[PDB]
Paper text:
DEAH-box adenosine triphosphatases (ATPases) play a crucial role in the spliceosome-mediated excision of pre-mRNA introns. The catalytic activation, the catalysis itself as well as the final disassembly steps are driven by so-called DEAH-box helicases. They all belong to the helicase superfamily 2 (SF2) and share at least eight conserved sequence motifs (motifs I, Ia, Ib, II, III, IV, V and VI) spread over two RecA-like domains that together form the helicase core. Two RecA-like domains, referred to as RecA1 and RecA2, build up the helicase core. The RecA2 domain contains an anti-parallel β-hairpin present in all DExH-box helicases, which protrudes out of the RecA2 domain thereby contacting the C-terminal domains. These domains are divided in three distinct domains, namely the winged-helix (WH), the helix-bundle (HB) and the oligonucleotide-binding (OB) domain.
Numbering used by the authors: 549 to 1111, 1116 to 1178
Write the structure that this text describes.
Amino acid sequence: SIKEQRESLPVFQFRDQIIQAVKDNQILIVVGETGSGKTTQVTQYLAEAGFTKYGMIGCTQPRRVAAVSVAKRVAEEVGCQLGQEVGYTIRFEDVTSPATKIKYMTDGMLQREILMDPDLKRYSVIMLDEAHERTIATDVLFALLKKTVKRRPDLKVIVTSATLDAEKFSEYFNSCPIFTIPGRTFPVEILYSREPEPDYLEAALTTVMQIHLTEPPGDILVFLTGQEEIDTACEILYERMKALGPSVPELIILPIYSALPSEMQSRIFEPAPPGSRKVVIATNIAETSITIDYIYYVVDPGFVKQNAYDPKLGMDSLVVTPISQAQANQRAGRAGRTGPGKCFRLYTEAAYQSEMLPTTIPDIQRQNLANTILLLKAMGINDLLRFDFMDPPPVNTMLTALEELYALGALDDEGLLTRLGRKMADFPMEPSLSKVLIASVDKGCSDEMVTIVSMLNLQQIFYRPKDKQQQADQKKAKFHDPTGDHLTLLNVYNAWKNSGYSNAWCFENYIQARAMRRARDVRQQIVKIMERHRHPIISCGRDTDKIRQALCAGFFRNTARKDYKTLTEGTPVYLHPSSALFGKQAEWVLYHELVLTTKEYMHFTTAIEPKWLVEAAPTFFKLAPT
RNA sequence: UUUUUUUUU
């Protein structure tokens, strides 16, 4: 029964050996294959081996869903109630009790816990799971746990790794042993394209057609790059199927991407009807976050939309670029979850061998780092450039982050953390947003600022479906403030609140309920943090300008003037068509982010008055006679 | 001027 499942897993074969390996070495690298089941077993093995006696067993996961899934299964396998001996902790949800002995958590959570307790006294063993994904939190934890083990001999650390990176991990973690566990995974025949494919979208559509018409049963999973590309692919495929007479077997074409509402996301999981073949046209969300059952075919175009930060210009760049080998292999493996399968790679073998990096560049080496830098300074680490990162971030990215924190008053001239800086690090957001919150206290608009900040944290607020695009834009424009997007975000939350937090209201007005529910969770958390720091939450009422004054305290660098050209570097930047300021004239502008997609676009742009810049940032804005 | 992959406190 329950025991039978634990024994079937291969990891049971090395159960005694794992426990001894953990006893023998303080830091152990574990290479776990897909079918190993190390996530739900190693945790227990140590708990049954008596490791639970003086500390807790913590295991990180890079995803919230993964943390709750595995905690549910390990609770069921241990036969206790979730929250008792086996619990989980993620943001807004601490499902643990004084009886908790095994604790699954998000890496983020443990990172934030190490700040208040750098020795992590409550834990006897820490396991870093799915570390091959190389989130910023995981990378930070590598360094911090390495330092912590020297202080704490009793602490035991386990770091899961990919096969290629296992040796690299070992040398970094004091040349400690590597434990490899075999995993049961069904074979996937990988077919490369004979010649390079000029158009990856067309090739993917052609390949879907081929498979459906000429291959044995089984649903297809296609990896594309964005929402517009996927919706265009769905429309095109449907029309090609119709072109053929109704004699040809039904092809159910379903998109999947995070912006897609949870109902429509749910329709992908549903089993296909009799004598029908499903194709799921997906982003990289299907690679790890979404696991779809009964996929036997994968079409691999070979591209992903990748974020890369340019600190010189203070701008993210989203570029469709070739995936990595690791990423390509992950994709292939999705055909092999339910049973044996095939993967059609639309690139030549040479291109896998020579045009694709063996590993995706880690997040820490291509994102803004202000948030990370502030946290590390808060923990009292100072020469961050020399800090023991496994893969060190670009030097310019670290210097700009440091300059940013200096400019906001988080750091003094000597580089050390200020009282403001310490306060700001207790808030979970980029430092520029925490600056604005604390500035809003003095400016008497804290109540509005909190909700606004909360909205900024969220992703995909306004739903814009393909067929009903115009209708969405109309409903969105009812909320537009004359000043632009920040106050528009305020309106959306207030109107949601005033409708009694209705999911119906959201659907009607083409607004993602998932986003609004998260905003309320974020808001409640922020309000608690404000109270702890004795910062009062004050409403500005009608005087909304006070919000705009507060925004300049944090976002003075992100400012532009119409011809728009950036105030600092003079670089041209453009209002995004979604903006409430789009068709409108406004001479002086403030924006939340500068992202380069097909054009350099300001995101969440708001109109400002230059007075507010010299008021809020006196040192950085000089007043001169013309 | 015409619309952003994934994910974390």
